[PDB]
Amino acid sequence: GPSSQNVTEYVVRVPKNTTKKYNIMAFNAADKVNFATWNQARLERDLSNKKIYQEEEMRKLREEARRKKYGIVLKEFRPEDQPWLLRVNGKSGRKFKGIKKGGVTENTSYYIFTQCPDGAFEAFPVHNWYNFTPLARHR
Amino acid sequence: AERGELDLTGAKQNTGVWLVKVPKYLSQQWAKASGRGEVGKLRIAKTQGRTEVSFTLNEDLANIHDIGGKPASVSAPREHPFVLQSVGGQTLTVFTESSSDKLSLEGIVVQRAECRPA
């Protein structure tokens, strides 16, 4: 098309060797997150729900059994779907809760393209995508 | 670097990465790479107020076929155009979790795009 154009080209590698999983940590623009202010940070799985009980429901005429019977269950602990807790700059700093995004797959998936020392790009699949928001927004 | 700590070098170093939506058949083809693991080339061509980004498979992967063997001419490797998208209304960062449980902020997403089938 154009008589002249400036072009940049990069070799792309897709490693199979990866002892690392790549994830997305997303912040809402409204929370105005600025990394320059981050001096230190901790990121740990929040296991608070592990010991939280929930009420689960378990001859008479059905219309005579309006009052149902309930028990309590200690759900299956999947540390994978437990949210993340991000704590920035000690006890007096900001805190965010990370929740996994779930509008799950179709015929595509996301990849992270990162540049390497030799100039090539290496592409890695996104393992999980988390939306992080101030702990104060969670109840 | 203690247990539970998030390494921050990447984010504050302002290291940038691209986040790309890839068709399943193309990523499946990338899995057929061997040797160095190269799959092709990313091309960025700029003209007056206009940018065209695309990905083209290398000769090796362009010649590995599924039950079919491709039709007409068998021409040259096909260009997969990228549809560029915005990232301004959100801050996306990448963090990794290694096999040893180490967590680190690797960089910030500076460009988003969707790779379209050729």
Cβ–Cβ contact B1 with A under 8 A: no
Our count of domains for chain B comes to 1
Parent domain of B82: 5-116
Nearest chain A Cα distance for residue B102, angstroms:
9
Query: What radius of gyration, in Å, describes the C-alpha atoms of chain B?
Result: 18
CA B56-B59-B61 angle, to 5 degrees, is: 80
Lookup: tokens for B62: 């362009």
Report d(CA A106, CA A117) in Å as an integer.
Answer: 34
Cβ–Cβ contact B34 with A under 8 A: no
Inside any domain, residue A3: no
Q: CA neighbours within 13 Å on the CB side: how many for A47?
A: 7
Parent domain of A91: 10-139
Q: Name B72's Cβ contacts closer than 8 Å, sequence gap at least 6.
A: none
By three-state DSSP, how is residue A50 classified? helix
SS3 content of chain B, % helix, strand, coil (to 5): 15, 50, 40
Residues 8-37 of A with CB under 8 A from B: 8-16, 19-29, 33, 35-36
The label of the residue with tokens 């995004």 reads A101
Closest by CA position to A40, among listed B70, B105, B18: B105
The label of the residue with tokens 């790309």 reads B20
Nearest chain A residue to B99, by CA:
A19
Chain A and chain B share a number of CB contacts under 8 A equal to 153
The structure was resolved experimentally with X-ray
| Closest CB to B12 among A12, A38, A115 | A38
Q: Name B49's Cβ contacts closer than 8 Å, sequence gap at least 6.
A: none
Beta bridge partners of B111: B18
Inside any domain, residue A5: no
Lookup: tokens for A132: 């992080």
Inside any domain, residue A42: yes
Strand B103-115, strand B16-23: pairing: parallel
The verdict on a CB contact (< 8 Å) between A10 and B92 is no
Query: What radius of gyration, in Å, describes the C-alpha atoms of chain A?
Result: 23
Nearest chain A Cα distance for residue B77, angstroms:
15
Cβ–Cβ contact B53 with A under 8 A: no
Q: CA neighbours within 13 Å on the CB side: how many for B67?
A: 0
Cβ–Cβ contact A54 with B under 8 A: no
Cβ–Cβ contact B73 with A under 8 A: no
Our count of domains for chain A comes to 1
Nearest chain A Cα distance for residue B72, angstroms:
24
The verdict on a CB contact (< 8 Å) between B41 and A111 is no
Task: Give the Cβ contact number of residue A86 at 10 Å.
Answer: 22
- Print burial letters for A7-43: b (CB count within 10 Å at least 16), e (below 16): eeebbbbbeeeeebebbbbbbeeeeebebeebeebbb
